[PDB]
RNA sequence: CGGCUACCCACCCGACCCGUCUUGAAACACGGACCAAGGAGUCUAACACGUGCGCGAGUCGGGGGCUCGCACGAAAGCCGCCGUGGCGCAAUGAAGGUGAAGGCCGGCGCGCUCGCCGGCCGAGGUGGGAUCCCGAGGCCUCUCCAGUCCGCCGAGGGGCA
RNA sequence: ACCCACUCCCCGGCGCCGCUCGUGGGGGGCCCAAGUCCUUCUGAUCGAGGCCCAGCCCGUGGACGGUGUGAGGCCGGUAGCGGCCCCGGCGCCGGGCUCGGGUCUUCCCGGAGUCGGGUUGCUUGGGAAUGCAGCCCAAAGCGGGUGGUAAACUCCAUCUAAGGCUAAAUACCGGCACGAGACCGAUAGUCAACAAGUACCGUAAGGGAAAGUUGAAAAGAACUUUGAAGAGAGAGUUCAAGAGGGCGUGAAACCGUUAAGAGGUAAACGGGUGGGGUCCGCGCAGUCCGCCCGGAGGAUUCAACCCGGCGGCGGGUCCGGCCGUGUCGGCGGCCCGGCGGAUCUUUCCCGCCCCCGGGGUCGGCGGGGGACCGUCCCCCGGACCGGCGACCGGCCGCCGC
């Protein structure tokens, strides 16, 4: 079976595969159906923007992607409470709420409540009769626009601190080194052993 | 850009008929029938051609003006010569010898003019 | 292109390019990698050494995200920032050094390669190699650890 | 290279007074082989499958 | 050019729907043009054929200026019969010859209560 | 039915072919040798006004 | 064309015609059958938009982000002038147009 | 009158019935009574090499989205803060992990089987190596004078892959 | 349960006007433009044209049917085309329910033969056993599950299982309709293009075919004669019966007849001739063409040369102007010009933030404004090519009139 020289192959075609083969011959039709559905939904909900519910600022969990930031599902109950709006009214306002998410960092809490405040300040809703408060006499001629695309108020485009340039300090030549990381790893590896040794030494005293 | 156009026209082009072992280029402005670079009349900046007159006597000579290129409306000047068998033969020869104007294919133009005059004689 | 394949020029030849003595039988030697240890051992040991057996310890539920650590070299350390930064540092108006953060570009560890320019730099990375750390300090640069 | 001017023609057939310059796309390398390759490989996209 | 995605250009489908058309569609298919002096009078181009109207052959073998009258409209065969357009058999008996209604031009129509309505509807639609 | 019907082409090669065709459409020889009747045409790139 | 105002209606019934847009240029319509050199009729705006859609060798295209005009291989594609130039024929060899056929 | 041939006939010579298994086939080895139609190396996934094309330490929108409803449009055009991602740009260990710049000059400490310092270009050296450069020497109407004019080369140098 | 400052609304029928994005859904009928001249043909849709506004329409030149090959002769097609009938929602006139938000004080807060363990099977990539199941053992409330290697000690992170409902993107070789095809073209394509799951076969489960083409129109052969009839000889229709009721076209194997040739080593076959025959080209003692010159007779305008004159070629002055390739320059189009840049300007602004409404840059965050950088827009001044970018003035030398 093998030849002179070649990469050994293990094709996973030993099963009866020809009776289950998904050909994507309906891909243009599926894309057309999805586009027509999007257009119909946007036309039915015209005063509200596409992908209406605002989504919070979400950091990636894993260490591979924790350097960038992305969108999420909904704002936390703590963020809603700091914003000052009720939990159940945010859904009809247009704010997606995620009750399962917790808040561990005030650095993200302040960013989320600031995003919520910006959304609330930019938001303009329509009443049934002018007897409802928190509105104006004229609704900016359909708010200058009916529907928004790719994010209700703002995407999650990444920003970065500048830290343009600075003068090197005196001890920076001997501040850090590879030996520093090596010592850190050695201490993290031998932390508990040293504690047990100190314990058994104090036991003898 | 004569060779650049010839590298495209030498094949995959219209007017070309090679049903038998010989090939023919058959352009509206061409002296011989060979599909060659030295006889093609559509790619050069200077081209001479002869044709039987539409009235029924005489020979029309088409010359590439070269004054305005890429303007096929006035890119060709057409003259009519209706003389005896020798006066036209000498005028066509002078038209290529006095001016530089593509000194080759002079014999080709002369042979085609004589051959069409032979058919116009009856 | 069937008109360009070989089967067209094989019409009229009874064996169809497979010989009269040994015909084209359906899997005459075996199906797949059959007999990797016998009657194919010569090929399997000449062209695929180390194929049979186990070597290392097993790691259940391995995640490729933990071992994610791209490396950047010193010759590429200047391709991350723009070109005007290098000329502004070479102008040398004072003892100020540009800061080149590799975390933005996507590298976590900096590895050592030679031929560095004589301009001081401030590098911020999670990991540094010994050779790179000595070579950046031999020019007057600084290394900053991040997390 | 040289990019001359091309006059505009009116709806009656004569040349208008305005004039526009020749774009740089018309001086691109003429590649019949590349054109034929692209045409051959792109014409196979609109065909429908057939089977027994 | 065709643009409605609900009408077909298939030759086989068109032939099938034409050969198996119901009787109320065969009467619309079997339509004949009107004469020039009558077209300007009625402001209509064509009109279906009935049993009482007169007609004049314009093309075929039995063509000419002799005015004729229809006697049978054979919807099944998409044909009409004329009393004077006939032929002799082997034994000498007469039999009508079939000519398609598209190859014949009408000169006279039976003024019926429904025919006038169809005429005025076509005229108002042509406007 | 799962035969490889469609073939994908690089966008750069697609644009290369388009520019090649546009540059070839501006030469009178290449368009005359295709079969078009351009003997009476004043200018080969026919640029008309916006009224059309 | 560009910025349709009803030209498709006026050009949709002429046989052999083809309707094409500047923003959507199709090779199947520009070079039918695999042969280049199809006769084209442009508009003023359609002709002015080409410099911004494809760009020149100096500046890149504005509509397309990372696209530039293809590079040009032979700067002078005329072999006749190059072979007949004095610089080439200055250091050439003798023609030597003798046949030297077979001698009996 | 001239005419090869897909017409027929005769003589002279040579001439065993085709296909494949076999060292050996015309065989007393197998299949074929004859004729017409159909009939057998295809397609998918993966791998290796070679070739053509485009870009180039980058490359690829095949997955989705956008423009206008479209016969040709199940096409084509675009995304640019959609490059997430695949391949390559870094390898070596079972793993914890580590992870690629040489050469010249001068000085000091015992220039010590000896480290450091300062300046420079910056991927070492040897033997081959297409090509290129320099080049003694001689090659063009009577003469000392010349830049083109006729026009190759001994030897030597930096040396692609 | 107090305190505080607030909210008058929502949900189910009934009559109507105007719309809903392709301009909501379903159904019937209608809507542009030659059949005009001439000539082929059995038959026309074939064949050139319809005055200088290109014979007419075109948002309708797809397709079908019609004696063949139609944009205009006929349903049909384009058209936010019209008129008619039926169904569903958006706004408005009776009827029944009807206290939300925050702080503080007090109380309440949970699913059991189930988790888990032992054991035995099936399964999983899941390995000291991922999941399921059978038997046995079978609990707790600072508890229990999980944290990918079994076990003990300690800490940490996450969730609240043994109760339930829910459209979305997803799949569809059956069903009801539709559209399309680089597929098949009657031994192919579904077994089945046709009275096909039919004829037929086996007791039954079940197996399962073959089979399209007259003619434009039957106009399917009247009538006379032979034969009892099958059939045939005349005649008749059709352009055609050489299309006569499984009848378009009509090959090979095979067979009959006619003509030619040949015949004891079966026939056949390759090399080279001869004889006969069909047929082909020529008209066979009589057939080669074109150029120049010297002679023999006639008729014509031009050519030599000059003049009028247009059209093209060539370079000199690059002349009055055109643009390409580079360097400055008006710092001018930066506000009545564009992009990018981890290059800047915290003595610029706006919204936050630290310290003592206000003050302090003491520092930081997001957005906007503007300064320098590399690519682009106009005139002047010049550097090179005047080249496939081109005009006039003047000249030599051509062509036709
Ligand atoms: Mg092998
Ligand atoms: Mg199997
Ligand atoms: Mg062989
Ligand atoms: Mg082989
Ligand atoms: Mg073998
Ligand atoms: Mg063997
Ligand atoms: Mg079909
Ligand atoms: Mg064989
Ligand atoms: Mg054997
Ligand atoms: Mg044997
Ligand atoms: Mg044999
Ligand atoms: Mg045998
Ligand atoms: Mg035997
Ligand atoms: Mg036998
Ligand atoms: Mg066959
Ligand atoms: Mg990536
Ligand atoms: Mg027809
Ligand atoms: Mg038609
Ligand atoms: Mg009509
Ligand atoms: Mg527990
Ligand atoms: Mg716990
Ligand atoms: Mg643990
Ligand atoms: Mg563990
Ligand atoms: Mg539950
Ligand atoms: Mg549940
Ligand atoms: Mg669903
Ligand atoms: Mg096929
Ligand atoms: Mg059958
Ligand atoms: Mg009888
Ligand atoms: Mg027949
Ligand atoms: Mg028959
Ligand atoms: Mg005989």
């Amino acid at each position: 079976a093998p030849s002179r020289n070649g990469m050994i192959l293990k094709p996973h075609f030993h099963k009866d595969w020809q009776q289950r083969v998904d050909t994507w011959f309906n891909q243009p039709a599926r894309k057309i159906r999805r586009r027509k559905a999007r257009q119909a939904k946007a036309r039915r909900i015209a005063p509200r923007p596409a992908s209406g519910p605002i989504r919070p600022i979400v950091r990636c969990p894993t260490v591979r992607y924790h350097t960038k930031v992305r969108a999420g599902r909904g704002f936390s109950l703590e963020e809603l409470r700091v914003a000052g709006i009720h939990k159940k009214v945010a859904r009809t306002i247009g704010i997606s709420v995620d009750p399962r998410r917790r808040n561990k960092s005030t650095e993200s809490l302040q960013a989320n409540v600031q995003r919520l405040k910006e959304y609330r300040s930019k938001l303009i809703l329509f009443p049934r009769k002018p007897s409802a408060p928190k509105k104006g006499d004229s609704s900016a001629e359909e708010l200058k626009l009916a529907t928004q695309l790719t994010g209700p108020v703002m995407p999650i485009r990444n920003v970065y601190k500048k830290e343009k340039a600075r003068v090197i300090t005196e001890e920076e030549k001997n501040f850090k080194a590879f030996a520093s990381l090596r010592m850190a790893r050695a201490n993290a590896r031998l932390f508990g052993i040293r504690a047990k040794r100190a314990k058994e030494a104090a036991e003898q005293d | 850009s004569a060779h650049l156009q010839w590298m495209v026209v030498r094949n995959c082009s219209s007017f070309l008929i090679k049903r038998n072992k010989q090939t023919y280029s058959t352009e509206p402005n061409n002296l011989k029938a060979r599909n060659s670079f030295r006889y093609n009349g559509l790619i050069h900046r200077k081209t001479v051609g002869v044709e039987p007159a539409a009235d029924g006597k005489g020979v029309v000579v088409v010359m590439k003006r070269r004054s305005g290129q890429r303007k096929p409306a006035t890119s060709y000047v057409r003259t009519t010569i209706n003389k005896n068998a020798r006066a036209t033969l000498s005028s066509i020869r002078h038209m290529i010898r006095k001016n530089k104007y593509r000194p080759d294919l002079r014999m080709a133009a002369i042979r085609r003019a004589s051959a069409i005059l032979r058919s116009q004689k009856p | 292109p069937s008109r360009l394949r070989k089967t067209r020029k094989l019409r009229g030849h009874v064996s169809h390019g497979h010989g009269r003595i040994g015909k084209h039988r359906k899997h005459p030697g075996g199906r797949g990698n059959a007999g990797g240890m016998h009657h194919h051992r010569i090929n399997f040991d000449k062209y695929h050494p180390g194929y049979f057996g186990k070597v290392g310890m097993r790691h259940y539920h391995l995640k490729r995200n933990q071992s994610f650590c791209p490396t950047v070299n010193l010759d590429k350390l200047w391709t991350l920032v723009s070109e005007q930064t290098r000329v502004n540092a070479a102008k040398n108006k004072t003892g100020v050094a540009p800061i080149i953060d590799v975390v933005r570009s996507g590298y976590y560890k900096v590895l050592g390669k030679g031929k560095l320019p004589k301009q001081p730099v401030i590098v911020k990375a999670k990991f540094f190699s010994r050779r790179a750390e000595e070579k950046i300090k031999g020019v007057g640069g600084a290394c900053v650890l991040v997390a | 290279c040289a990019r001359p001017l091309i006059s505009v023609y009116s709806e009656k057939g004569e040349s208008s007074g305005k004039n526009v310059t020749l774009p740089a796309v018309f001086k691109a390398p003429i590649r019949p082989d590349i054109v034929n390759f692209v045409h051959t490989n792109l014409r196979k996209n609109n065909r429908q499958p057939y089977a027994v | 050019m065709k643009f409605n995605p609900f009408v077909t250009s298939d030759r086989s489908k068109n032939r099938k729907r034409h050969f198996n058309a119901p009787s109320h569609i065969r009467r619309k298919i079997m339509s004949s043009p009107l004469s020039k002096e009558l077209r300007q009078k009625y402001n209509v181009r064509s009109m279906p054929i009935r049993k009482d109207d007169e007609v004049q052959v314009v093309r075929g073998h039995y063509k000419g200026q002799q005015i004729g009258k229809v006697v049978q409209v054979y919807r099944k065969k998409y044909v009409i019969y004329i009393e004077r357009v006939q032929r002799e058999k082997a034994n000498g008996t007469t039999v009508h010859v079939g000519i398609h209604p598209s190859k014949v031009v009408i000169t006279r129509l039976k003024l019926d209560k429904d025919r006038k309505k169809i005429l005025e509807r076509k005229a108002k639609s042509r406007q | 039915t799962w035969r490889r019907w469609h073939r994908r082409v690089n966008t750069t090669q697609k644009r290369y072919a388009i520019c090649s065709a546009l540059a070839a459409s501006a030469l009178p020889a290449l368009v005359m040798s295709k079969g078009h009747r351009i003997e009476e045409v004043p200018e080969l790139p026919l640029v008309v006004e916006d009224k059309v | 064309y560009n910025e349709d105002n009803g030209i498709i209606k006026a050009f949709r019934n002429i046989p052999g015609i083809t309707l094409l847009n500047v923003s959507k240029l199709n090779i199947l319509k520009l070079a039918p059958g695999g042969h280049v050199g199809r006769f084209c009729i442009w508009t003023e705006s359609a002709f002015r938009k080409l410099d911004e859609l494809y760009g020149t060798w100096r500046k890149a295209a504005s509509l397309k982000s990372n696209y530039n005009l293809p590079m040009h291989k032979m700067m002078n594609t005329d072999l006749s002038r190059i072979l007949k130039s004095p610089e080439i024929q200055r250091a050439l060899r003798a023609p030597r147009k003798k046949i030297h056929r077979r001698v009996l």
Side-chain angles (χ1 to χ4, degrees), chain A residues 195-205:
Chain A
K196 189 175 67 65
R197 288 180 196 168
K199 170 194 58 180
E200 56 82 20
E203 181 204 29
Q204 278 76 243
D205 167 71

Side-chain angles (χ1 to χ4, degrees), chain A residues 14-80:
Chain A
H14 293 267
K15 299 184 180 183
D16 176 279
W17 62 273
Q18 281 199 329
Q19 281 72 14
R20 36 187 199 281
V21 171
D22 283 18
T23 57
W24 285 35
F25 292 139
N26 48 9
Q27 178 190 0
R30 166 191 303 176
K31 295 186 71 175
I32 288 179
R33 281 198 291 104
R34 288 181 179 178
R35 187 172 179 267
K36 286 189 180 300
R38 288 191 289 269
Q39 287 186 351
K41 178 190 177 185
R43 189 176 305 146
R44 177 179 57 90
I45 209 64
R48 288 95 166 279
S51 46
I54 175 64
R55 289 158 178 79
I57 296 296
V58 164
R59 184 77 68 173
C60 286
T62 178
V63 68
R64 177 179 173 184
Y65 298 100
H66 79 301
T67 174
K68 60 162 295 182
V69 79
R70 66 174 184 85
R73 175 164 186 170
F75 295 89
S76 178
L77 261 64
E78 201 46 86
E79 300 154 4
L80 266 293

